[PDB]
Amino acid sequence: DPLKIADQSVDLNLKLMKWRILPDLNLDIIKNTKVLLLGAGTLGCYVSRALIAWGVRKITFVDNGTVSYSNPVRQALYNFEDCGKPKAELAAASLKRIFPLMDATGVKLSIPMIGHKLVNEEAQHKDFDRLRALIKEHDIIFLLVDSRESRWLPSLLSNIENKTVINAALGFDSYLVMRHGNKQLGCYFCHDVVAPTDSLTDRTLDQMCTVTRPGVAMMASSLAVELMTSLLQTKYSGSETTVLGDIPHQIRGFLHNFSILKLETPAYEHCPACSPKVIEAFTDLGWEFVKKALEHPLYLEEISGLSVIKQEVERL
């Protein structure tokens, strides 16, 4: 039976990795990891391919988009004949074409961007609940959206549900891969991940630059998955390493000079996404809080305590 053989083949490939090279490697915890991918664009496509090669069985894509004419060359699950079709379900179907016994599903769902007025209070209210449900349902959340403002709601919700989160963000010629965390590490929002004073091309990071160098998404996707697999391994006593090596908080890569930097950031007290007051506010008010924060980001800064900080500065 060909299908059974294709199954036995991939688990076997992975077990030979373990016994030939890394006997301490825990492969089951990788296979049984339920993965949610927020974004079925270039990152979602490459991340999913890396995950299935590592034997991940359950992957869920979330995307509200449609396959465009320019998409297939950059986004590695789509063909020319797919143009027009809904992305998420297509992505899932494409995975099952590679590996038929995958538990891959697509959900067509929008993620509200902070700083934008709501278009349909009710529709997006539903979508909000639905998003929270998917996040609670899964084990690892990959945030693979095109901009900072689509990152906020899923970050908050992932923190609320205590899920490990892995962000990837692209600029023209550099990328960021970071984990938020299950001395706390701190999320994408805790600190400026890029300074107003840095390079012009570095400021394209997470601004839906549609014109990144093709290689950026490939590098970022594979590091993100390699970071996940290492992270799932037990840590060594007195060491931030596992059988697979390091588990950095953040990885920044640059194509122009072929470099990679690792760095770490503590959780910030007035973070708009993970600060205790923002949690407290969400826990007390729910969607009513979220809705106000979404349409009025400055409200978020009153809650976080960031405004009171900015005001004690002004007062000097």
Which one of the listed residues 45, 187, 190, 209 is annotated catalytic? 209
d(CA 134, CA 139): 10
Scanning 21-86, the segments in alpha helix (DSSP H) are 28-31, 42-53, 71-74
Q: Which residues pair with 60 in a beta bridge?
A: 36, 105
Nearest Cα to 35, choosing from 196, 143, 114, 128? 143
C-alpha angle 279-266-190 in degrees, rounded to nearest 5: 50
Alpha-carbon distance of 22 to 7, in angstroms, equals: 22
CB of 297 to a second copy, least distance (A): 27
Helix (H, G, I), strand (E, B) or coil at 35: strand
The alpha carbon of residue 305 and the mean position of all alpha carbons in its chain are separated, in whole angstroms, by 26
190 binds, among a second copy, Zn ion, none (CB under 5 to 8 A by kind): Zn ion
Count of residues in the chain? 316
* Binds a second copy (CB under 8 A): choice among 53, 109, 185, 285: 53
Considering the rule CB under 8 A, would residue 316 count as an interface residue with a second copy?
no
Q: Which amino acid is at 90?
A: L
| Stretch binding a second copy (CB under 8 A), from 31-39, 184-192, 246-254, 279-287 | 246-254
Instruction: Please choose, out of 33-41, 129-137, 148-156, 247-255, the segment that lies near a second copy by the rule CB under 8 A.
Output: 247-255
Q: Yes or no: say if 194 and 207 are a contact pair by the CB < 8 Å rule.
A: no
For Zn ion, the closer CB: 144 or 190: 190
72 binding a second copy? (CB under 8 A): yes
Among 24, 85, 100, 309, binds a second copy (CB under 8 A): 100
Using rule CB under 8 A, residue 315 touches a second copy:
no
- Chain centroid to CA 286: how far? 23
**Residues 229 and 54 sit within 8 Å (Cβ to Cβ):** yes
207 binds a second copy (CB under 8 A): no
Candidate list 116, 123, 215, 276; residue touching a second copy; CB under 8 A: 215
10: contact with a second copy by CB under 8 A: yes
Residue 209 annotated in active site: yes
State the helix-helix crossing angle for 42-53 and 214-231, rounded to 10 degrees: 40
Ranges within 139-178 binding Zn ion (CB under 5 A): none
In whole angstroms, how close is the CB of 168 to Zn ion at the nearest point?
17
291 CB-side CA count, 13 A: 15
Q: 171-190 mask for a second copy (x: CB under 8 A)?
A: -xx-----------------
Nearby residues of 182 by Cβ (< 8 Å), 6 or more positions away: 162, 163, 164
Give me the least distance between CB of 47 and a second copy, in Å please: 10
Enumerate binding residues for Zn ion (CB under 5 A).
187, 189-190, 271, 273-274
The residues carrying an active-site annotation are: 209
Enumerate binding residues for a second copy (CB under 8 A).
2-3, 5-6, 9-10, 12-14, 16-17, 20-21, 46, 49-50, 52-54, 68-70, 72-74, 76, 78-81, 83, 97-100, 172-173, 201, 204, 210-211, 213-216, 218-219, 221-223, 225-226, 229, 244-246, 248, 251, 255-260, 262
